[PDB]
Amino acid sequence: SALTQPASVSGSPGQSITISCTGTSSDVGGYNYVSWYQQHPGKAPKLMIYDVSNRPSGVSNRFSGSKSGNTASLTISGLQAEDEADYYCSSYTSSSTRVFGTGTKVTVLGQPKANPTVTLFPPSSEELQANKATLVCLISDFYPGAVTVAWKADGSPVKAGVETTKPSKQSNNKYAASSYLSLTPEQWKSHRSYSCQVTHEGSTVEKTVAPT
Amino acid sequence: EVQLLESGGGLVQPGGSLRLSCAASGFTFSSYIMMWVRQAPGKGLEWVSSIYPSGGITFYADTVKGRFTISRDNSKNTLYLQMNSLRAEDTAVYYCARIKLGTVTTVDYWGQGTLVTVSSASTKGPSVFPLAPSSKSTSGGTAALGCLVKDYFPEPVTVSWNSGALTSGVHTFPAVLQSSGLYSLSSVVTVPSSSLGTQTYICNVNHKPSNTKVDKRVEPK
Known about the structure:
It is classed as cytokine. Keywords: nonoclonal antibody, immunoglobulin, antibody, PD-L1, Soluble protein, cytokine. The assembly is dimeric. The entry is titled "Crystal structure of a Fab". Chain A: Fab heavy chain. The structure holds 2 protein chains of 2 kinds. In chain A, 5% of the residues lie in helices and 45% in strands. By secondary structure, chain A is mainly beta. Chain A has 2 domains: 110 residues, Immunoglobulins (Immunoglobulin-like); 101 residues, Immunoglobulins (Immunoglobulin-like). In chain A, strands 1, 3, 4, 7, 8 and 9 form a 6-stranded mixed β-sheet that branches. Chain A starts with 7 loop residues before the first strand and ends with a strand. Chain B is mostly beta strands. Chain B folds into 2 domains: 120 residues, Immunoglobulin-like (Sandwich), CATH 2.60.40.10; 101 residues, Immunoglobulin-like, CATH 2.60.40. The radius of gyration of chain B is 22 Å and the shape is elongated. In chain B, the strands form 4 sheets. In chain B, strands 2, 4, 5, 6, 9, 10 and 11 form a 7-stranded mixed β-sheet that branches. At the A-B interface, strand 3, strand 7, strand 8, strand 11 and strand 15 of A face strand 5, strand 10, strand 12, strand 13 and strand 17 of B.
């Protein structure tokens, strides 16, 4: 029905990790036709291992494959930050079909704490002319990926019209998130100054904007 | 060298249809097994269908049997996927895959994929707003300026700066999925404050599902 892989495998730099792929006697346990793919966010998969243990040209010997019973394994030695990706096994089925595994998300720990850079934009005059108002709070270059976002209108909170993304890793291996506060031009012009305050590791960075 | 270029993807209503194409080059197309693999957003890889070199032997995932048809035109070096009676669940990136000679399932080359969205919601082109650098920027060192790409559907939007000539200091943030079902995104460039009077900054927003190509000039104030 599907190839069972652990959902998550975490590791530290320089360490070795093993990703298991368990099937049945009619797929993984039945044939030496098991392949492994590495997939980075927003990118196409890449063939790492084929026929259980064979590595294609250009693929590091840090990647190795093995099989025992109904279980196939991918070992990554000397863990590097660039090994952080999604990994999939696949096998031929007795049904003549093709089946990929459930996928394992590999996360490589150890990178230093990074405080977020906060950029707050008020609504644009073009948007206000369209009888809409959006305050944009952009949060980038942080680690770990956990942030708290609070919105304030010259004191007291703002719960209504708030929409925040889930922190995501960017090309620099640091997290980025965005928070939008939706207002009416009347609400925006009524208050003295609005504030975006992001909390990361107990330390709160605050940016403030005003109708000026 | 080896090229696998998909086309034909897009937004379609449930019960609708689409024909995907994969243009191949750099190899003897006719001697390879070809495959389609899909990936629903944030989900795993899923085999769809396979086609043997001559095009006589085909295979299908039970999930697409009776609705999808794989075909190839060896003379025109093209792989096809006719997809009928599409449903929300068929929403995925569709990859064209080349099977390694001497294997039946091992993919040596994958395409970049074509995104297929099945939804009862219609395309919405974005409203693009300039995000002018802070009033006291040229009174400092660095300036952050941007473009707010509001209320579009479906994903993606690509944002470039100065027709692609400005790539350094550019950060296009992932989109927020609002309660409304519409996305919003922001792209920012970090530039020298001193260049704000000298340099013109334009963001090039492309949202292919709605055929939107917007160039927004971002002026200081």
